[PDB]
Amino acid sequence: XXXXXXXXXXXXXXXXXXXXXXXXXXXXXXXXXGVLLPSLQSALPFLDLHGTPRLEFHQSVFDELRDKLLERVSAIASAEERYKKLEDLLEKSFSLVKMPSLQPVVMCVMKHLPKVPEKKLKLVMADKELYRACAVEVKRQIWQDNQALFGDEVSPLLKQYILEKESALFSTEFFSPSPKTRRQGEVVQRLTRMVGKNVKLYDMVLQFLRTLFLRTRNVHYCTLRAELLMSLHDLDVGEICTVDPCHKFTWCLDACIRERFVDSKRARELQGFLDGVKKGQEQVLGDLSMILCDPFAINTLALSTVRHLQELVGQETLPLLLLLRLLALGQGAWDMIDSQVFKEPKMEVELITRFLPMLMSFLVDDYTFNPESFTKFLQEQRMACEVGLYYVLHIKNALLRLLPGLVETFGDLGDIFLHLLTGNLALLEDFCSSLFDGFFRKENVHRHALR
Amino acid sequence: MPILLFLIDTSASMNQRSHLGTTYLDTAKGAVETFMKLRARDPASRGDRYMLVTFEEPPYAIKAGWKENHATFMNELKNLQAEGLTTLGQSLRTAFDLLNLNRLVTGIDNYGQGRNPFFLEPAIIITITDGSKLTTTSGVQDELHLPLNSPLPGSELTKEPFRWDQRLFALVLRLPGTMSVESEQLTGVPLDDSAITPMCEVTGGRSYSVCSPRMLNQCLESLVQKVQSGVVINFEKAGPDPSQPWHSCHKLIYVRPNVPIGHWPVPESFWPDQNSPTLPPRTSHPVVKFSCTDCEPMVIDKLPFDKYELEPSPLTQFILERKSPQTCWQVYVSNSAKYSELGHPFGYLKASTALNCVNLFVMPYNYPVLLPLLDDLFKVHKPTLKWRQSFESYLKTMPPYYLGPLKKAVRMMGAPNLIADSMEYGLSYSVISYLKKLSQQAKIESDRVIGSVGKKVVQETGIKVRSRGFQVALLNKDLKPQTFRNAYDIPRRNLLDHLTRMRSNLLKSQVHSVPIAQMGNYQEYLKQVPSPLREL
């Protein structure tokens, strides 16, 4: 029910035609209601002679004058003169908020470069009350105004966490191998819901999502940050990528790790980016959160560590690629447990050398054919290398010898379900795998589905 | 439009005189004409199909079937002769085959895709018989056993010869030779005690034991009152009381047209899987089990749901006795869920607000978990993924045949492009191929049987002179003595008179044996006659 001048005229006509006779009054009101250059009265008896529709004519002229030149409205919206014309059109169409404003809202959305917050607050309130169709401009205004866009992003973050939990529960026959291109889902719609060339709102939303995933969230969060960074890099989001100084570089490094998982040049680039980094408060804590929250990145780093251990066992030079992998594991182990400056306490050289010698001895035994103390030390030691050791063991006589070690490590030590599923999918040994699985709700369901 | 199939006993025991002086077959024919008069009193019987099956051989058993008009039905009902044996089981099998041969070619049964009460062809079989023993030219039987020797293609899918929408009623004639004085004959008609009674009761019908012409008229009025459009549903008591006779009943629900409209099927007794090559045989009456525990009727706005009024029965009397229209009794079929053998409630039994009738409301398969969920989305929401993971949890338990009706219901509700609109796998390719081949063979015997009801069965007899291949001819009914064309047809007793009549016929110098019904043709004779002039 659009008011304004038209609504006032309708109210006046209703007040005038409120009984009291006046048959000529109704005719005067009908004649006064015919737009300009009164040849419409000349066209009237041409249409009156066969059951006169006036509603058909009015709806037809409204529909053509809207739809045919909404393209012209967009063309004049597509700099200073066009922006001023769009502002004037928005000021004219603001009075028709209760009126149907599909075209009136599209005219303001097309020239939405000037925010105009004095009417923008009322427009945002009306859009929140009436669920307006302004998608991009409405989302940008909601992100820049208050935490309504923050609440919308928190709901999508919870939905993404629930989807990740359901995917972890729904087991299948390699930790869901998918790069940034094929994983376009559940974040491409959220990325399009972002402001686009809105560095401040997108950065605030990313910071809120990272804080929610770190302080009161699992490790499932903070991979959506890498997903949205990859989507913006592939989407040609120049401003958002250029806002983060090292964020684009570490996102490219993460994409290269996800694409291949074995590259010395990528490791050198990551080491060079970490060497000349800023302080741990800004660009260091965020980089640590991006390293820790990446589950697919963590799996790629574990595969790279296994490959580097195999290469070191082949070369027989235990004691820089292994050091780079250890530094990456220490950086991406966890940083959201305690909020503080950027620190990298890691690289146990003696324990790392003891763990690598066990894998080297297992490989040498497997090569020659075609233990418990090392497993106890791994269970009573750093589990970051334990995950890599379990992944290496999961994927003739050497395998039979390492099966008791895998059973001992299974009885020693959340993330082990994915490693066990990968080992079962990659792999006489079936009975040993079933005995290891039965020696321990997602893990039991995965064991039942495997057998 | 209903089908009235009359299974007239044409066994020779029907030639028994009553106190009326007429045989039982005469009483049977007159019962049929009085039934048709009382049916024609109802002005909703403007479209009504009458069929006639006798006890004769299957070439001659079906006297009027599909595509037989009223005149042929009457002319063959009048000309019945009770010269056969009491082959009740074979005649019942032929009657059910004549009712069910079109079912697979037109797909009323909807096999494997849910039991649709609106997919019905409402027919009742009124068998008029006596209490004599059943005979099969080797002895008496003393128990009714329908033979399964030459099955119609697809008969194994239902495991019983009768169907969902077919009810067998027996009008057992027990008129004595001498009139019996009785003042208690104005009371209710007793159930008969012959072998036809359990077979009538298992199809949702009943047997009438008449003993007088007024009892016969009372039974005919009751039979006219029982010509309805509905399907027979077996109701069972699932839990304890909230054995009494309301525990089990093969009652009738009513399917009122506007063609009937409906959305939800009664669920099958199995869980459909594409691994099984053969569709499981389902009972002709779906065994539903009502929950005696009180629940709450759950209806949301714009919801496609179907309400079926139960016919009066001990179950409806029990429900209306516990006067509580605000509550409902949830109903479900067993072994319909993928895991639970008990099943999920597909509907509830709610008494009317006026305490008049008991209505069966059929719903989606698990309505207490879908209606709050779907009502929640259409009250709050643009689906959310927290809702959609719950909706997928419902779709994991829903049988596959509900997916089509659910898609149509949410399409007409206001959410066209919902998840229910995405794909429809249905049955196994072996089952679809089997059903299509069964439809083709059903067409084959459909055009076989319909072509063989009339002008395809002519009987000629012989004496078959024994040796201690020659035969002696009989006086044929259709002798047609061509006495003017054949000299051998002229008897010696009137040889001279017929000779001079032939001589008068050939030179320049039978008729008036019109078969009675056409000898008084008022309209036909004047139509061929020229019209006169008109008055001043």
UniProtKB/Swiss-Prot annotation, chain A:
Widely expressed. Expressed in heart, brain, lung, placenta, liver, skeletal muscle, kidney and pancreas. It is found in: Nucleus. One of its GO terms (cellular component) is NELF complex. Keywords: Acetylation, Nucleus, Phosphoprotein, Repressor, RNA-binding, Transcription, Transcription regulation. GO terms for molecular function: RNA binding. GO terms for biological process: cell population proliferation; negative regulation of stem cell differentiation; negative regulation of transcription elongation by RNA polymerase II; stem cell differentiation. The keyword Iron-sulfur does not apply. The NELF complex is composed of NELFA, NELFB, NELFCD (isoform NELF-C or isoform NELF-D) and NELFE; the N-terminus of NELFB binds to the NELFA:NELFCD subcomplex. Binds RNA which may help to stabilize the NELF complex on nucleic acid. Interacts with the first BRCT repeat of BRCA1. Interacts with KIAA1191. Interacts with NELFE. Belongs to the NELF-B family. Essential component of the NELF complex, a complex that negatively regulates the elongation of transcription by RNA polymerase II. The NELF complex, which acts via an association with the DSIF complex and causes transcriptional pausing, is counteracted by the P-TEFb kinase complex. May be able to induce chromatin unfolding. Essential for early embryogenesis; plays an important role in maintaining the undifferentiated state of embryonic stem cells (ESCs) by preventing unscheduled expression of developmental genes. This is Negative elongation factor B. The lineage of its organism: Eukaryota, Metazoa, Chordata, Craniata, Vertebrata.
From Swiss-Prot, chain B:
One of its GO terms (molecular function) is transmembrane signaling receptor activity. Keywords: Chromosome, Nucleus, Phosphoprotein. GO terms for biological process: protein localization to chromatin; regulation of transcription elongation by RNA polymerase II; RNA polymerase II transcription initiation surveillance; snRNA 3'-end processing; snRNA processing. Residues 3-227 form the VWFA domain. One of its GO terms (cellular component) is nucleus. The keyword Methyltransferase does not apply. Widely expressed. Expressed in heart, brain, placenta, lung, liver, skeletal muscle, kidney and pancreas. The keyword Transmembrane helix does not apply. Component of the integrator complex, a multiprotein complex that terminates RNA polymerase II (Pol II) transcription in the promoter-proximal region of genes. Component of the Integrator complex, composed of core subunits INTS1, INTS2, INTS3, INTS4, INTS5, INTS6, INTS7, INTS8, INTS9/RC74, INTS10, INTS11/CPSF3L, INTS12, INTS13, INTS14 and INTS15. The core complex associates with protein phosphatase 2A subunits PPP2CA and PPP2R1A, to form the Integrator-PP2A (INTAC) complex. This is Integrator complex subunit 6. It comes from Homo sapiens. The chain holds residues 1 to 604 of 887 of the full protein.
